[model samples]
Target chain A: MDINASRALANVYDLPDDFFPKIDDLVRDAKDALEPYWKSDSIKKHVLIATHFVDLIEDFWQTTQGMHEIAESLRAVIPPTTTPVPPGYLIQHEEAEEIPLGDLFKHQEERIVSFQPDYPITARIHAHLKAYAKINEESLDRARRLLWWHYNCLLWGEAQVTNYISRLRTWLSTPEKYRGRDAPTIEA
Target chain B: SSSSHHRSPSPRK
Candidate 1:
């Protein structure tokens, strides 16, 4: 793992010293958690889960918020210009395609839907946290790390494609007047 | 931003 890249990002983002150490175990844990799936052909089915898991981590690291939580907060504050998909549901492609009747039945039995974490990725994250708690015991760091890694591995490719400079540029560009102005309410 | 939902919500929001 290129921890130095993460470390450099920690500085750029002004993350706590504890942040890096807290997340180190997370990377290892996720690798181990996905190892069994990675070995099987079922890995193909898990791509969405993996990608979303990465998103969760990146969001947690950057904003200290889970994806659904952030989405909900935004919805509460902003009026929609048009109808929007409910936050928890993942949006699917607009193109329609024919499905075999048998495959439709299979999906019904599988309970596959366009949204929610019922799929393998959520299952993996759930299983990993439970197993980690039993084996290593629990800490807030572990809990937050779980949230963080969940977003990250899915979107950022498990740190394989994290764009530190671009993210830092956005963070740096925020106006001083807006910096932490609502911290008490938001951070609370 | 072009009101694309993919864009992050305003920070103030």
Candidate 2:
């Protein structure tokens, strides 16, 4: 649509010169002469959104890792934390019990006991995560513009895309059930 | 005029 204005960004990249041509046709046209959403709504917003999605995730990981380290420091005073964990269940109906230190650190939110504390503006993490999860779809991922070339290659097939979609959904869905679940709390 | 995660650390680009 706004590949013209996209040039603002396009100029910086070490892209192949042949990448430019055929200036329009990303959407339906009743107003054929009219420019696409380029002038009003820049391509940069969605691109930034996609990038921020990862930024927040990595920040969340860093925060959680820090929290896990803090929790580990207090383990001697606290009851050894337990989470709903499963063993290699050739054994059936084995209920959740005393999770090990190995399982404990990676996902600390699963602990039902002691020290459900807040960190700096954690609610934003969930807010951004759900936003990113929604973007896993084709429309907002802007597949045609950025990734149309992907289909030509064997790498990152449809299955890979589907995996990321499901993986992001699962990541946010589990958080909805624990620790920072209530976005309404609006915690600082 | 606009903000950027694009201006973020190198790995993201």
Candidate 3:
């Protein structure tokens, strides 16, 4: 992470004390609602991520917080074992001997572009968090995106969070400009 | 990389 980015993120002090309690309650409510799913193999990651998100907020509430520090702290909550892998796969290597151009085209067509979530629990958790953002009505779009990033980081590992640390830092720098406005969708 | 804005909710909202 860029030191300047870290400093910019650390400069953010927009949140108020009362906001922390509300977020705390929201996380607890989410945890309670997810009780049955917590033990499910598929739902475990989401549960852990939510728990960690709450922990992050609490830590920030108590100490000097910044986007970079928050991003760094996420490493502790997100277990290394939880990294996502494709459901199933098969590898096909090109022949040592030259292949026909038509055959190469055929192979390209067979590639899997995307895969579905391994469990329905992932989608369920997403819906719950989306609703949470809607009810709060703060920066609904940004909240949704932030939660999405956090969830993906949990699902994909440090790479996902690492990819977005700068984005988080940028967001923190001018949060007031984004308040209550619909954020234009972009690749995360 | 291009970035979009994010916000922390206002207190008591």
DockQ for all models: 0.02, 0.04, 0.06
Candidate 3: CAPRI quality band:
incorrect
Report, for every candidate in turn, its global Cα lDDT versus the true structure.
Answer: 0.39, 0.31, 0.40
Top candidate when judged by DockQ against the true structure: 3
Ranking the candidates on lDDT from highest down gives 3, 1, 2
Q: Which ten residues in a row have the lowest lDDT in candidate 3 chain A?
A: A88-97
lDDT, candidate 1, residue A94?
21
Model 1 per-residue lDDT tens digits across residues A1-188: 24554333422124333534456465556656666666763644234354344445544444432433544555555444433333422112121124453443333323334433344433333322333233222223444444443434444553342344334434546776866543221111
For the predicted complex of model 2, DockQ is 0.04
A151 Cα displacement, candidate 2 (Å): 14
Which candidate ranks first by lDDT, i.e. highest? 3
lDDT of 3 by residue, A1-188 (tens): 56444333432133322322345455555556556655664545455555555555445443332333443444444444554433323222324125464554333224223244342433323332333233233333234333434444445653344435445545545677664354222244
- The model with the greatest TM-score is 3
Cα lDDT, model 3, residue A120: 40
TM-score of 1: 0.22
